[PDB]
Structure formats: structure tokens, C-alpha cells
RNA sequence: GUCUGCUUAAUUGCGAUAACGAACGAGACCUUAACCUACUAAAUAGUGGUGCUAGCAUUUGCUGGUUAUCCACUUCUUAGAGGGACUAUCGGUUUCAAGCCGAUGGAAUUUGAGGCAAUAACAGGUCUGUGAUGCCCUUAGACGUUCUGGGCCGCACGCGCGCUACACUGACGGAGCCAGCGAGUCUAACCUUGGCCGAGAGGUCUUGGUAAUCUUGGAAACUCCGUCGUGCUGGGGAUAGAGCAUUGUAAUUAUUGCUCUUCAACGAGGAAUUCCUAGUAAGCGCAAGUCAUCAGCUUGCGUUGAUUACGUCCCUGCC
């Protein structure tokens, strides 16, 4: 379907791939959606990144954290463990990996199972520190859904991190070993074995 | 004659020079065309703008982009601005005027840099403490 | 390294779908130094068909 | 290129200088479970030697155990450039030589007890159990 | 496990010692005209669909 | 009539005497009509001597950044041994240095 | 029509490396297996080999890319920082020696030359020998 | 903040008395004018007088 | 006068007022980072055109090399003059006062940032910077001067400031392969290439450079292409044995480095408790300040670069 014939052959593989089409031309963001009502509105499915980097003026305006592409509040977290602190290009050479080890293992739309590790991974029934005295109760109150997803990424990063940690497994195989088992969530993961562990510290205090 | 018109590029440090003339195909960056990107993961940064539009348009439009300033990712927007910049400097001086309006409603959508370079500064440093808003240790 | 480590390997790593070198130390356990070898070997029409990149990860896979 | 079919002459622990070695470890070390040798005299006695640098410590012809006990101990002969060295000028017996396994432990020893006969300050500050290089250590 | 999804109407006044709590009305999306006044924890607005499996505790204003 | 291609190289601490001298310069020389350029205008050096404020450790750690900002400024000018000398003598002034690095 | 630029930064590396491995002319200086290149590397080059024929296409593509330079220039380039250990990590300038001797061996055939102002300029051959071999490394990409 | 000042108000409030007629809200036509009238220090100060004024003729009507 | 109130980064300003109008501070001002396709010039910055030219195409093309082959340029890169922004323009929001949001244009939270920093002081520190200096003491068996040797580096331990790491989101390796702040030799040894000798650490011949003119355009995080495969490892690099080097009259209480082997803890850090609102937090480097050397510090820069608010008086602290 029409190869440009410009000396400089700038691809006919990444020309039929991204002319016919938008979006990162490995994963098609194209009939992939969200299945809950609450975390629509507060989790971009995608404005087109044709890669997984925007300057990023996301915290001036008290909200736009919203407008922030999910994929690039993720690579965002990983950003740590302190020593890397700064490295985004190590963090996209790692999640540009992650989306191939979900596609490969399940056989899914993996950018969706990326999204289903969001709404499922969110703590709703959550506590707060009432002050209150020397001792009081964590009046149990359901976060906005704003906060929720702040946690739903935050959680996931503090347990697929120890898994490489004296580990044969290179976060690419533990991250996708968390999201497949965190959406099926299961409890072989770390959210649905803390998310539940905060529901479950509240259900009393309440 | 030559028909040439033409521009600069600017993101936090350096420049490019799009010499957008009349030839046959080419898109030379640093003495090395764009298939040959440079920090080859970001590689897709510049690949959006040839296709964000017809790889159709840029057959006509020849860009020898020299790239100085500004560590590797600085200039990446500087050479992005400049292929669009002039995208409308060709589509302003040369190719009409609604071809700058059909564009900029394509190119305005990622509503990003692309067209308008970044604003943000590095903050000056001070006395006492080390990157910027840091104050030295405390005592008692 | 003896001769029920390579033929456990090849009859187990044609339709064995997801692989690496963390895949041969957790499934076939000892080695790794060697492993990135009897995987990659060949690449005879009946070993692994990959979507692998560089060095730093070698993410391989199914001939079919 | 494959899993190499290692027969048992894979032999599974090794013994070089009485001083232990392990036998399915990637060599240059293994020559490093030793005194007085460490991946630099080790990547010469293997290049001046007909070696593998990727073989293990068990997988060792013996013509490659006795040539690799042998360059070791000799020093100037299979080009050992003498700056390459520790017993740099004896200064008691010159000499161009190597202080080894059992022997870096009784020569560490015999260098302190040509300056404790003296009564000076390179082996009297080793003598008070506290350090000779000039600093103030208290923390440690 | 019955989930009642309740929509926030009127964000009211700030609370808590540390400003960790807003107050909150809510309009029950899924039974409109009910208009209960719970609490929540977040940096809120009007229209944050809000999630409660606890239908209902109706809450009172915490130092 | 021996021609010479002189080069005029200035420096001061005030942008107001100084600018004064390539207005006077290049219009006490286009009177003379000379073959010249226009007041070239060289990167602004610009010294910041950090110093603490106190006379004695004591006292918070409480510092200064005083500096001379020159505006370096040069020119051109042909003309024999007669009408570069009548030009160098005239601009005559407070604040300022003129060299005549001559090009015979 | 067919460039050194039009082609990548490690195929030309490994496909002039297996050209200058299999030329024999190239000479190979006597402290070019042992000796640590750079002194903060502990490890010399992990090849021990014809890094010398991988530093013979680097050096060489590197010249031509610019005008002229070398030996106290390929002195600031090939090393990196330092491993000071404990002491906050520090640049270290190689050893002018090996490429002060490939630069006097490239001098031999007609690849690299001495640029007037002086020091290494590729000749007029030389370049002939890099536009022949950027078009033989463009067809392992094609 | 964004909170206005005396020198400013009391400079527009003196002005607004005489010059309601030349008077406007395109404030970029006052800015010019507001020099021919006041004898102002600054450029910044001046751009904050007329800002206020335009906050008079936009509510006066 | 110097204030109920509203106002701000602010005794910063409208307004209320037997209080009228001024001085210092703050702000104004000076430094630097941004912008000027208008000026003024550049074989110590670079363009095309020009040959001379070295390759691939042969299609005129594409890829070069050339401190002069010539010139012509001045976006670039430097840098002088200069200009330029005031929260501007409507819209709101208010005592329709001072002010505060938002969206457009814009290069552009006090434009960012420092530096100067009254009023009164503190018995804070310092005669161990002084040939600034009171008064005591010292004056040749001196507490003054100087050749040596060790000493401030001595450890069961108590307390701060810090470096690498508990991984496959990493460690090892080829192969891509990228800045900015500097500095620098003169009366003599500061930077060193290049081209050799050394596995290396280096050695050296010889070279340039009082420096946009030389080393000096090639720094690391990384993209490359993979080996390692959940094995305290192929994370960890402790402590050790020798040699070989490179300085230093002195290398011992190994100044550093290399060459190879010994393979110490720790498997994410309790009662505590810091610093931080934008190129900001933090990590990967390097040039200077020492200096003969020996940085795990001091300063300064950039190259990648986000979370989180953009608000309160719960606290402390001070007004």
C-alpha cells in the first residue's frame, strides 16, 4: 500500500506499520479500554506514545497528574533503590520489556492487562491518621479515587523490586510475574498479600 | 533561485539548522541521517513529526540538519521542533497558508513542545547546601 | 554439565513457549554461566523462534 | 555453542601449592583461591600459557595443571616484566622474583623481622598494633 | 460483597488536625435522590464517583 | 599617501561614556568617509569575588558577589599616517581605554 | 550511491575490525596483548587480541569523523573516569603508545595521514578504503 | 497573590476621576495613554496601574 | 506617627486616622541564565560556492580530504553596543480599593537566581593569619630556633559527616558511543599529544602550546548485540599473599597504581530523625581548591530527570 520512494530509505517496515494507523507500533491503545466506573477519568486509555516521553509539566496544575500517561505515571515509582534515582532511560529501554514478557505470558492485549492491574489493585476502604490522642482510630474513610490509583502504582513497586534482589530474575520477570498474578488479583503478588492487609484493617475502627 | 527556506531549533541548551531546499528525498542529522538515530531507544522521538502527515511531503523537502551544545537527550526536541518549525516555515514562506492551518491542527494535538519549545529554567544555587532547594544539616 | 542436562533441554525447548537463562536455573537448575549457549546454540528447523535485545535482556520463545 | 559431552577426567575438585581449590566453579581465580596471585599474574600465566580463560578448575590436561604448578614460583622467562611485581628488589638476596602461596605468609613475615632488628619507624608504628602510613585513625 | 457506587455532590469543609481529611455530601448513582454525609481522604473534587461497599455510616464530623 | 587598515580596542565599566565614544567613533569617521565596520560587541568579561561577610567562624554560614561588568567592546578604520593620528588623537575622556593595534 | 554516516557505528568496527584481522602487512606492536592499555581500568581488554583489530576501525571513521588531533587528544577519549573506590569517583587520560603506533602503522599502507597543522587527517586511498568498505557493511544491513 | 497596592489604586482612583472621557477597557489602549497624562516611576509599575484602572470601566457600565 | 481591617516575599501597599509629611532597611540597584534571521567584525568561530581532490554511483548524483586554492559570506559560534516584560490583553473575582485566579499572546513562582544587607547588640568565636595588639612571662641548661628520628594514623569501645551494595529495572563483556565549569610552561619543567617500547601500570623520544591558537571535539549513566538464569551467585569486593611499576634525601606504622588469587559482612536498615515545591529530588561523571604526591571532602558545572503540594497554624521556632 504505497512505498515512500524518497539515498535515504527511511523504513518500509516502520513507514506498512505506522503510516496504514496511531500508537506505539508494537502494541495496538485501538479497541482497548477500561472496565470499571470510578479510576474512568483518572487514568489516561492513552494519548499515543507513535514512545513509552512527555517534558512533563504535571505538578504545578493541582490535578493534571490525572492527562498523565499510566505508562509514562509508571516508568513513574520504578524511579528508585536511591541509586538509579534519575534514570528514566533504564526505567524505558524495563517497561518496554514488561509489555512483551504480560504479551508473551496469557496471550493477551498486554497494554490492557497493564490497565487491569489498575482497576483491582486499588485500595478503596482505607484508613487515616484522626490527631485522635495518644491512641485512637484510623477514622476509616474510601480515599477521592484520585489518591486510589496513586497507591495502585506506588504498592506494586515495593514488592516486584525485592523479587531482582539476590535474584535470578531480571522487573522486565517479576513485575510480568506480578501483574498477570495481580489483576486474577491472586495473592502470589504483593497488593491483593497489602491492598486487601488496609481493606482488612478498616473493616473493624470502622 | 534557491527555493532556500529555513530555520533553527532550540530544550534547556542547544540548537538545529533546517537549509530546507529543493532536491531528491533526504534528512541528514549531525552528518548521519535521523535510519541512523543516535541514542537508539528514544529513537522514536524524532520518528513522529515524515509518515504525524505524508516520508509525500518530505520527498520534495530537503533537510541537512546541523547538530550542536547540551548527556544525550537534550537536543532531541531542540531536532523535532526542527522538522515541523520548518513544516511551517516550508508551509509558510513557500507552501501556501491554509497548509499551515489544515497543520499546527495536526502538530497541535500532542499539544506539546514539536512546535513551542520548553520554558522551565534551572534554579540558581545557594549559599548553604547542595540539587537546588537544599539547606545544610541541623544541631543542638 | 553431564548428558541428562542437554537431553532433558532439547526434548522438554521447541514448543516450550516462554524462555531465558532465569528459565533454565528455575526449571533445565545449576549453571547459568554457560546457559546464553545451550538455548541460541541452532536458532535443522526445530529449536526456538524468538522476539528477543543487546547483551541487556534476552527475553527467547515456538519452528511454529 | 553447546553443552560439551563435561566424561570424568571432568574431575570435580582440584589440587594449585597445597593452598584448597574448587572444581566446577570460570578459572582465572578457581588460579586468586590463593595468596600472592590475582587476576593479573593470572591473565599472564594463561596467555604465556596454552590456556583456556573460560574452562573451569576441574577440566585440567596435566602436561595445564604442572605448567600453569610451574612462568609462578622462574618469574623471568615466559616474558614476566619484573613493575609486574610485589618481591620487587629483595634488598637483604637484588631479586626479580615472585612471593607465592605458603610463601607470601613467611616472606607478609620476614620483611618486618630487617626493620625490627633496627630500632626504626616503618616497622615500629606492625609493632604497637596501631597505623604507619601517617593518618589519624580513631574512628575505624 | 455488595458494592454501592456513590457520586460526590457538595464538597463541604476541611477537617482533621493535618488536613488529611476532606468533609463530604453524596448522591447515590446506582437511587439518585438520597443525599446522605460521609468522609474521605484525598486531594478531592466535585464529581469524584466515590466507592463504598458500606452502604451508610450515616458519618459525623475528627482533631 | 601610504594606507594602513587600523583596528580600534575599547573597554570600560559604564555602558554610559562608552557607547558615546562608537557614536562620536563611527561618526567622527564617516564624516571622513572610514574604507571600516560597525562597533563589534565582545562577549560580556565578569568577576564575582565569593567572600564571608563577617569579620570573625562567628555567626551563620553569610556570604556576599561584587563584580566589574565590562562592556568588552572593537572597531576598524583605512587612512595614511596623517588622518588616523588628525581621530586614535581625538576620541578625546573618563572611564575608557583605546589601543591602536596598527596593521601596516 | 553510497557512504562513513550512511552506515552504523559498529558494523563498518567489526566488518573493518575482519578486513585490517585478515590483512597482514597488519604490523602488530610488542606490548599489544599484555600491560593494561588504560590506569583506571584492573582489566586490560577482554579480547587480548587482533582491541589492537577492533581499535583499527574506531581512531582509523573517527578521523576523515572530523578534520584533525593525534596523542594527548585519542588520550582524553579512550578511558572514562576512575575507580577510586572509597574518595568520590573521578577523568583519566590511557598511554599515548598504541594509537602514537596505529599511529605509525595505518602511515604505512595509505589509510591514515599526518595533517599539516601536525598529527592525524585519512589520505586521499584511505577514505577509497572507507566509503570500498562502508559499501561491502551497508550490504550486511541491506 | 494575585493583591493590589496603594502606591497603585489610590494613582487609578485619582486618574479615573478626570479622564473617564481621548476613556477604555484593547487595556492596551490605556497603557499608551496612561503616560501622556501620568508622570510615572516605571515599565512594570505602569502595567499594574492600568491592569487596575480596567477592573473600572469593566464594572462601571 | 508604628494603627481595627483587608493586602503581600515584605511597616509590601490602599484604606480606618489629631495626626502632616520624610530618612535608613525592603524594594529600587549590581551579577549571571535566557531572546533578538535588525545592526558591528572576525586564516585564534563557520558557510555556500570553489578548484586540488580520495571512494561509492555512474543520473546530473552521493560520500569525503584541503589553517588559503581562492574568494564571498556572518544564520550560526563568539560579543559589543543596544533594545526588550509591564503580570499585558479581555474575562471574571473583590470595600468592584490594594490584590487574586484563568486563558491568549508570549523567548520569558521577585523574568530565575544570587551579592549588598539598617536599628541595637552577644562579655558567642578568635592575641594558634599578622611586623594589628595590651599586661603578665620568657632571654642562652630560653618556651628562641635547627638537624635527625618517632609523634598528632596508636584501640574492647560512645557520638556525628560519608562512600559502594542486598540484584536479571543487575553484573560482566564487545559495539554504538555523548557536554559544560577549568587550567597551563619563564626564567624552567606546566600541559604533554603524536609515533614507537610495556598484558598492564607505564616508559620514553620527541612534539606543540604563555593559549577560542596545543593537550582539547571522543566523561560516565545509555542505545546497541548478548552471555549469565534465581544458584549469598555471574549480587557483594572485605581482608589478605606476592611480585611489577610510578613518584618521593627518606616510602617501614605497604603515598598510589597495577598485575593474578585469598571471596569478609549484608539478603532493604529498630528508638530516632533529617531535608526539599521545578530542569526542582536524586545518580552518573568530571575540571578547579589542596598539591611533589595521597579524596571516600570542598567548590562549581552540565548530561538524564520525575513523584508530591502549589496549603495551612495540629506542632515547634520565632515574631
Nearest to D78 by CA among D54, D36, D50: D50
Cα-to-chain-centroid distance, residue G108: 15
Residue A94: partners with Cβ closer than 8 Å, 6 or more residues away: A75, A78, A171, A172
- C-beta atoms of C41 and D2 within 8 A: yes
The whole-angstrom separation of Cα H22 and Cα B73 is 55
CA dihedral G66, G67, G71, G75 (to 10 degrees): -20
The whole-angstrom separation of Cα D55 and Cα D53 is 6
Nearest to B62 by CA among B130, B1, B118, B6: B6
Please check whether residue G115 is in contact with residue G68, taking contact to mean a CB–CB distance below 8 angstroms.
yes
Does an H or E element contain E52, and which?
strand E50-52
Please check whether residue F49 is in contact with residue F67, taking contact to mean a CB–CB distance below 8 angstroms.
yes
Length of chain D (residues): 140
State the residue for C-alpha cell 581500568: G41
Hey, is the C-beta of A105 within 8 angstroms of any chain C C-beta? yes
Q: How many Cα atoms are found within 13 Å in the side-chain-facing hemisphere of A40?
A: 6
The whole-angstrom separation of Cα D39 and Cα D27 is 10
CA dihedral G96, G101, G107, G112 (to 10 degrees): -60
Kindly state the cell numbers that stand for D111: 620483611
Q: How many Cα atoms are found within 13 Å in the side-chain-facing hemisphere of E44?
A: 29
Residue F66 Cβ < 7 Å to strand I: yes
Nearest to G60 by CA among G117, G1, G19, G91: G19
Nearest to G48 by CA among C27, D43, A133: D43
Does an H or E element contain B21, and which?
strand B21-22
Classify burial at F53, counting beta carbons within 10 Å of its beta carbon; exposed 0-12, middle 13-18, buried 19 or more. Answer: exposed
The whole-angstrom separation of Cα F66 and Cα D138 is 43
What are the Cα distances from residue E18, in Å, to A60, A129, A143, A198, A201? 22, 8, 15, 20, 21
Query: Contacts by B60-63 with C-beta closer than 8 Å and gap 24+?
Result: B60/B22, B60/B90, B61/B20, B61/B90, B62/B19, B62/B20, B62/B21, B62/B22, B62/B23, B62/B24, B62/B25, B62/B26, B62/B27, B63/B18, B63/B19, B63/B20, B63/B26, B63/B27, B63/B28
**What's B28's DSSP letter?**
B
Question: Parallel, antiparallel, or unpaired: how do β-strands B61-62 and D21-22 relate?
Answer: unpaired
**What's B76's DSSP letter?**
G
- Do G and F touch, counting CB pairs below 8 Å (3 needed)? no
State the residue for C-alpha cell 503478588: A189
Kindly state the cell numbers that stand for E35: 443525599
* Peptide linkage before G95 cis (omega within 30 of 0): yes
Kindly state the cell numbers that stand for G83: 575507580
- CA-based nearest residue in chain F for residue B137: F61
- Provide the residue ranges of all domains of chain E, joining segments of one domain with +: 1-63
Nearest to E45 by CA among E4, E10, E20: E10
Kindly state the cell numbers that stand for G50: 587482533
The whole-angstrom separation of Cα G71 and Cα G104 is 12
Kindly state the cell numbers that stand for G42: 584492573
- Do D and C touch, counting CB pairs below 8 Å (3 needed)? yes
Residue F82: partners with Cβ closer than 8 Å, 6 or more residues away: none
Which ranges in G10-128 belong to alpha helices (H)?
Answer: none
Q: Neighbouring chains of E at 3+ CB pairs within 8 Å? A: A
Resolution of this entry, Å? 3.7
Hey, is the C-beta of B71 within 8 angstroms of any chain A C-beta? no
The whole-angstrom separation of Cα E15 and Cα E31 is 28
3-class DSSP state of D87: coil
Please check whether residue G85 is in contact with residue G38, taking contact to mean a CB–CB distance below 8 angstroms.
no
Question: Parallel, antiparallel, or unpaired: how do β-strands B21-22 and B61-62 relate?
Answer: antiparallel
Task: Tell me the CA–C1' distance in angstroms for F101 and I192.
Answer: 33
Which ranges in C1-64 belong to alpha helices (H)?
Answer: none
The whole-angstrom separation of Cα G131 and Cα G105 is 20
Please spell the DSSP secondary structure of G41-68, one letter per residue.
-----SS-------SS------------
A55: nearest CB among B26, B58, B120: B120
Does an H or E element contain E7, and which?
strand E4-7
Tell me, letter by letter, the H, E, C secondary structure of D89-108.
CCCCCCCECCCCCCCCCCCC
The whole-angstrom separation of Cα D88 and Cα D84 is 9
How would you label A79-99 residue by residue, b for 16+ Cβ within 10 Å and e otherwise?
eeeeeeeeebeebbbbbbbbb
C-alpha dihedral sign at G9, G11, G17, G20: negative
State the residue for C-alpha cell 443525599: E35
- C-beta atoms of G42 and D81 within 8 A: no
Residue F17: partners with Cβ closer than 8 Å, 6 or more residues away: F93, F94, F95, F96
Strand partners, E27: E7
Please check whether residue F40 is in contact with residue F26, taking contact to mean a CB–CB distance below 8 angstroms.
no
Q: Which segments within chain F are labelled E, that is strand?
A: none
- CA-based nearest residue in chain D for residue G36: D40
Substitution target from B38, B42, B114 for chain A, most A beta carbons within 10 A: B42
State the residue for C-alpha cell 595443571: D65
Please spell the DSSP secondary structure of E29-44, one letter per residue.
----TT-------SS-
Please check whether residue B116 is in contact with residue B77, taking contact to mean a CB–CB distance below 8 angstroms.
no
The whole-angstrom separation of Cα B42 and Cα B40 is 6
**What's B123's DSSP letter?**
P
3-class DSSP state of E5: strand
Residue G136 Cβ < 7 Å to strand I: no
Task: Tell me the CA–C1' distance in angstroms for F43 and I129.
Answer: 38
3-class DSSP state of A35: coil
**What's G103's DSSP letter?**
-
State the residue for C-alpha cell 511531503: B57
Cα-to-chain-centroid distance, residue F18: 7
Phi, psi of A13 (to 5 degrees): -100, -25
State the residue for C-alpha cell 500508537: A23
- C-beta atoms of C6 and D10 within 8 A: no
Strand partners, B22: B61
Please check whether residue G12 is in contact with residue G57, taking contact to mean a CB–CB distance below 8 angstroms.
yes
**What's B121's DSSP letter?**
P
Please check whether residue B65 is in contact with residue B98, taking contact to mean a CB–CB distance below 8 angstroms.
no
Nearest to A129 by CA among E39, E12, E16, E15: E16
How would you label A31-59 residue by residue, b for 16+ Cβ within 10 Å and e otherwise?
ebebebebbeebbbbbbebbbbbeeeeee
Amino acid at each position: 500500500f504505497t512505498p515512500v520512494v524518497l539515498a535515504t530509505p527511511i523504513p518500509e517496515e516502520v513507514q506498512q506499520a505506522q503510516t496504514e494507523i496511531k500508537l506505539f507500533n508494537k502494541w495496538s491503545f485501538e479497541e482497548v479500554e477500561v472496565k470499571d466506573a470510578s479510576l474512568v477519568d483518572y487514568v489516561q486509555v492513552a494519548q499515543p506514545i507513535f514512545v513509552a516521553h512527555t517534558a512533563g509539566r504535571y505538578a504545578n496544575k493541582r490535578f493534571r497528574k490525572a492527562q498523565c500517561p499510566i505508562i509514562e505515571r509508571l516508568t513513574n515509582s520504578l524511579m528508585m533503590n536511591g541509586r538509579n534515582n534519575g534514570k528514566k532511560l533504564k526505567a524505558v529501554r524495563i517497561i518496554k520489556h514488561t509489555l512483551d514478557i504480560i504479551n508473551v505470558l496469557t496471550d493477551q492485549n498486554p497494554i490492557q492487562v497493564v490497565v487491569d492491574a489498575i482497576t483491582n489493585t486499588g485500595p478503596r476502604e482505607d484508613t487515616t491518621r484522626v490527631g485522635g490522642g495518644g491512641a485512637a482510630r484510623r477514622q476509616a474513610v474510601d480515599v477521592s479515587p484520585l489518591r486510589r490509583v496513586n497507591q495502585a502504582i506506588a504498592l506494586l513497586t515495593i514488592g516486584a523490586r525485592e523479587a531482582a534482589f539476590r535474584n535470578i530474575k531480571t522487573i522486565a520477570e517479576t513485575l510480568a510475574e506480578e501483574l498477570i498474578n495481580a489483576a486474577k488479583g491472586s495473592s502470589t503478588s504483593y497488593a491483593i498479600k497489602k491492598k486487601d492487609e488496609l481493606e482488612r484493617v478498616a473493616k473493624s475502627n470502622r | 533561485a534557491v527555493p532556500s527556506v529555513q530555520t533553527f531549533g532550540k530544550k534547556k541548551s542547544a540548537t538545529a539548522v533546517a537549509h530546507v531546499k529543493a532536491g531528491k528525498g533526504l534528512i541528514k542529522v549531525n552528518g548521519s541521517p535521523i535510519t541512523l538515530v543516535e541514542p537508539e531507544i528514544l529513537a522514536f522521538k524524532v520518528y513522529e513529526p515524515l509518515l504525524l502527515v505524508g516520508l509525500d511531503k518530505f520527498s520534495n523537502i530537503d533537510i541537512r540538519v546541523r547538530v550542536t551544545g547540551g548527556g544525550h537527550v537534550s537536543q532531541v526536541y531542540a531536532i523535532r521542533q526542527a522538522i515541523a518549525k520548518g513544516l511551517v516555515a516550508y508551509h509558510q514562506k513557500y507552501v501556501d497558508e491554509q497548509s499551515k492551518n489544515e497543520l499546527k491542527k495536526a502538530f497541535t494535538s500532542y499539544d506539546a513542545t514539536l512546535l513551542i519549545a520548553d520554558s522551565r529554567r534551572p534554579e540558581p544555587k545557594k549559599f548553604g547546601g547542595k540539587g537546588a532547594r537544599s539547606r545544610f544539616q541541623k544541631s543542638y | 554439565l553431564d548428558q541428562e542436562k542437554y537431553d532433558r533441554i532439547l526434548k522438554e525447548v521447541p514448543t516450550y513457549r516462554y524462555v531465558s537463562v532465569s528459565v533454565l536455573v528455575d526449571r533445565l537448575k545449576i549453571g547459568g554461566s554457560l546457559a546464553r549457549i545451550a538455548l541460541r546454540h541452532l536458532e535443522k528447523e526445530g529449536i526456538i523462534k524468538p522476539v528477543s535485545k543487546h547483551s541487556k535482556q534476552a527475553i527467547y520463545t515456538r519452528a511454529t | 555453542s553447546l553443552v560439551v559431552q563435561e566424561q570424568g577426567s571432568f574431575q570435580h575438585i582440584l589440587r594449585l601449592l597445597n593452598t584448597n581449590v574448587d572444581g566446577n566453579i570460570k578459572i582465572v581465580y578457581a588460579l586468586t583461591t590463593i595468596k600472592g596471585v590475582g587476576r593479573r599474574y593470572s591473565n599472564l600465566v594463561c596467555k604465556k600459557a596454552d590456556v583456556d580463560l573460560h574452562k573451569r578448575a576441574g577440566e585440567l590436561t596435566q602436561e595445564e595443571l604442572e605448567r600453569i604448578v610451574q612462568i609462578m614460583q622462574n618469574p623471568t622467562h615466559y616474558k614476566i616484566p619484573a613493575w609486574f611485581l610485589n618481591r620487587q628488589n629483595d634488598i637483604t638476596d637484588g631479586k626479580d622474583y615472585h612471593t607465592l602461596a605458603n610463601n607470601v605468609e613467611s616472606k607478609l613475615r620476614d620483611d618486618l623481622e630487617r626493620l625490627k632488628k633496627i630500632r626504626a619507624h616503618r616497622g615500629i608504628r606492625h609493632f604497637w598494633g596501631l597505623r604507619v602510613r601517617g593518618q589519624h585513625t580513631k574512628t575505624t | 460483597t455488595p458494592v454501592t457506587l456513590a457520586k460526590v455532590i457538595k464538597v463541604l469543609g476541611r477537617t482533621g488536625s493535618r488536613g488529611g481529611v476532606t468533609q463530604v455530601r453524596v448522591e447515590f448513582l446506582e437511587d439518585t435522590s438520597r443525599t446522605i454525609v460521609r468522609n474521605v481522604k484525598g486531594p478531592v473534587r466535585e464529581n469524584d464517583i466515590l466507592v463504598l461497599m458500606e452502604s451508610e455510616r450515616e458519618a459525623r464530623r475528627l482533631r | 599617501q601610504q594606507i594602513i587598515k587600523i583596528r580600534i580596542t575599547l573597554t570600560s565599566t559604564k555602558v554610559k561614556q562608552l557607547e558615546n565614544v562608537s557614536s562620536n567613533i563611527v561618526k567622527n569617521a564617516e564624516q571622513h568617509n572610514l574604507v571600516k565596520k560597525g562597533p563589534v560587541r565582545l562577549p560580556t568579561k565578569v568577576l564575582k569575588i565569593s567572600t564571608r561577610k563577617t569579620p570573625n567562624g562567628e555567626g551563620s554560614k553569610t556570604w556576599e558577589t561584587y563584580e566589574m561588568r565590562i562592556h568588552k567592546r572593537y572597531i576598524d578604520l583605512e587612512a595614511p599616517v596623517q588622518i588616523v593620528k588628525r581621530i586614535t588623537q581625538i576620541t578625546i575622556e573618563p572611564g575608557v581605554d583605546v589601543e591602536v593595534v596598527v596593521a601596516s | 550511491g553510497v557512504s562513513v554516516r550512511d552506515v552504523a557505528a559498529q558494523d563498518f568496527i567489526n566488518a573493518y575490525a575482519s578486513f585490517l584481522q585478515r590483512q597482514g602487512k597488519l604490523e602488530v606492536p610488542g606490548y599489544v596483548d599484555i600491560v593494561k592499555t588504560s590506569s583506571g581500568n584492573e582489566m586490560p581488554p577482554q579480547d587480548a587480541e587482533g582491541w589492537f583489530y577492533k581499535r583499527a576501525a574506531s581512531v582509523a571513521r573517527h578521523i576523515y569523523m572530523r578534520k584533525q588531533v593525534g596523542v594527548g587528544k585519542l588520550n582524553k577519549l579512550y578511558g572514562g573516569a576512575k575507580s577510586r573506590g572509597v574518595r568520590p569517583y573521578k577523568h583519566i587520560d590511557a598511554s599515548g603508545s598504541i594509537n602514537r603506533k596505529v599511529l605509525q602503522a595505518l602511515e604505512k599502507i595509505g589509510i591514515v595521514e599526518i595533517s599539516p597543522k601536525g598529527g592525524r587527517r585519512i589520505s586521499e586511498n584511505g577514505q577509497r578504503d572507507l566509503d570500498r568498505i562502508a559499501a561491502q557493511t551497508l550490504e550486511e544491513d541491506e | 497573590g494575585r493583591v493590589r497596592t496603594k502606591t497603585v489604586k489610590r494613582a487609578s482612583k485619582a486618574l479615573i476621576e478626570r479622564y473617564y472621557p481621548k476613556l477604555t477597557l484593547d487595556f492596551q489602549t490605556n497603557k499608551r495613554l496612561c503616560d501622556e497624562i501620568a508622570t510615572i516611576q516605571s515599565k512594570r509599575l505602569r502595567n499594574k496601574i492600568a491592569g487596575y484602572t480596567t477592573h473600572l470601566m469593566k464594572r462601571i457600565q
